[PDB]
Amino acid sequence: RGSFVEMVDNLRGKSGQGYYVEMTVGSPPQTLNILVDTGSSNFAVGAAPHPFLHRYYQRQLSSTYRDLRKGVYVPYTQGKWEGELGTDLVSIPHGPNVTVRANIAAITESDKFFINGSNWEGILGLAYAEIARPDDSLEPFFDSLVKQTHVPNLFSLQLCGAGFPLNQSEVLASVGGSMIIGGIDHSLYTGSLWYTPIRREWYYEVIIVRVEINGQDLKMDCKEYNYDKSIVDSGTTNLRLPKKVFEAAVKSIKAASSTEKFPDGFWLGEQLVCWQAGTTPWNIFPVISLYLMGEVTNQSFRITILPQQYLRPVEDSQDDCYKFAISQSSTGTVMGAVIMEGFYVVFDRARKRIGFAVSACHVHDEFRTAAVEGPFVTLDMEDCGYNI
Numbered sequence: 001r002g003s004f005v006e007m008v009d010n011l012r013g014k015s016g017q018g019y020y021v022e023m024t025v026g027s028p029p030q031t032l033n034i035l036v037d038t039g040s041s042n043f044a045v046g047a048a049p050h051p052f053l054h055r056y057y058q059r060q061l062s063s064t065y066r067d068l069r070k071g072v073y074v075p076y077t078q079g080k081w082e083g084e085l086g087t088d089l090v091s092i093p094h095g096p097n098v099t100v101r102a103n104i105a106a107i108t109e110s111d112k113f114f115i116n117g118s119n120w121e122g123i124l125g126l127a128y129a130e131i132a133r134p135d136d137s138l139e140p141f142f143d144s145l146v147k148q149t150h151v152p153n154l155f156s157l158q159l160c161g162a163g164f165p166l167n168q169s170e171v172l173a174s175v176g177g178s179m180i181i182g183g184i185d186h187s188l189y190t191g192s193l194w195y196t197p198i199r200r201e202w203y204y205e206v207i208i209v210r211v212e213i214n215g216q217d218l219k220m221d222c223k224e225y226n227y228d229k230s231i232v233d234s235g236t237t238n239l240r241l242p243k244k245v246f247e248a249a250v251k252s253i254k255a256a257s258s259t260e261k262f263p264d265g266f267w268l269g270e271q272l273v274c275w276q277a278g279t280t281p282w283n284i285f286p287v288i289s290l291y292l293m294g295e296v297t298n299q300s301f302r303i304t305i306l307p308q309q310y311l312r313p314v315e316d317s318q319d320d321c322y323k324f325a326i327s328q329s330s331t332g333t334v335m336g337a338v339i340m341e342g343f344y345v346v347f348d349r350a351r352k353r354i355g356f357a358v359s360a361c362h363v364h365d366e367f368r369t370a371a372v373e374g375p376f377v378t379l380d381m382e383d384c385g386y387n388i
């Protein structure tokens with residue numbers, strides 16, 4: 001049974017541009033669409049006109065706005081934002097029926113931060129205070145929500161990829177998934193939930209202990225899979241792998257799919273590949289299994305994804321086109337939105353663990369499905385974690 005009907009289907013979006021939830025800020029409430037981001041810890045909202053924003057937070061119109069008299073500059077590789085810190089009353093209309101006083105970074109200037117046509121105006125960083133900007137004294141939203149209300153210290157995400165391109169109108173009219181705040185909705189997954197420990201509370205850090213491509217062991221020292229960390233990040237599109245792991249994985253995926261040759265640009269995630277309508281040869285592409293440390297000593301479990309997760313549908317014609325959604329990283333493994341689309345993911349902060357189950361909305365075919373299976377006996381799993 002599904003016990004969180006009020007929160008089911010409260011997300012919209014897609015892997016290319018992000019999944020967002022409606023929120024309100026200020027008095028009277030100002031509605032904004034906000035990116036759900038498990039890879040950052042600031043609640044940061046557009047607060048000044050921008051060519052890609054149709055609306056923004058207007059602090060002068062909120063009677064409950066409190067100015068913290070402090071600026072913040074946040075540069076990323078992917079862009080940058082500058083803002084002004086304050087607090088205000090915040091609600092999630094399709095969430096728990098509560099209003100909390102939370103920190104808000106009011107974005108006044110930005111570079112390559114906002115995405116044209118994404119339909120979101122801010123980011124909800126759901127990770128821990130350690131990585132909050134400017135520092136860990138800026139309490140993240142979820143910490144405020146738990147402290148001020150009786151909402152349990154857990155949230156869960158079901159990101160739903162359509163399996164085909166959605167145009168501007170369809171992506172606005174379509175349900176993109178669910179963010180269950182304070183619980184688990186059992187209608188969103190099939191099979192069992194398997195849990196991996198949160199290694200440390202900063203990002204949602206986990207430990208990968210084995211990687212297979214179509215059941216063939218990638219056979220690298222497991223420290224390589226987590227060099228320099230492995231995280232679960234709804235604010236990244238792709239599955240991102242450390243350089244050496246990416247090189248080994250692409251070699252293995254090319255070998256498994258060798259009956260068709262794809263240009264170098266496809267494997268670089270830059271160029272699309274197209275097939276005649278309905279003829280995508282899913283079967284030539286391998287499944288990918290990531291084994292994660294279990295909660296029991298010397299036990300692991302695996303999550304298996306299909307090419308329907310790691311090939312991202314894009315518009316070209318009536319052809320079915322895709323981009324390869326696995327890419328190289330110099331900051332560790334990132335299990336991004338395309339991986340999360342295969343699973344219902346439970347961020348059980350209270351028990352310092354992350355749960356995975358097969359998603360009721362994952363894209364598959366009649367021959368293969370995504371999977372979450374276990375247990376497997378795995379020794380010296382702590383050695384897979386990277387230090388320094």
Ligand SMILES: CN1C(N)=N[C@](C)(c2cc(NC(=O)c3ccc(F)cn3)ccc2F)CS1(=O)=O
Pocket residue numbers: 014015016017018019035037038039040076077078079113115123233234235236237337
């Ligand atoms: C990886 N990153 C992350 N998790 N959060 C940040 C806040 C971020 C995320 C986005 N996310 C996105 O734009 C996005 C796009 C498609 C998706 F499926 C998910 N997220 C945009 C700006 C930004 F600063 C910083 S980042 O280092 O870039």
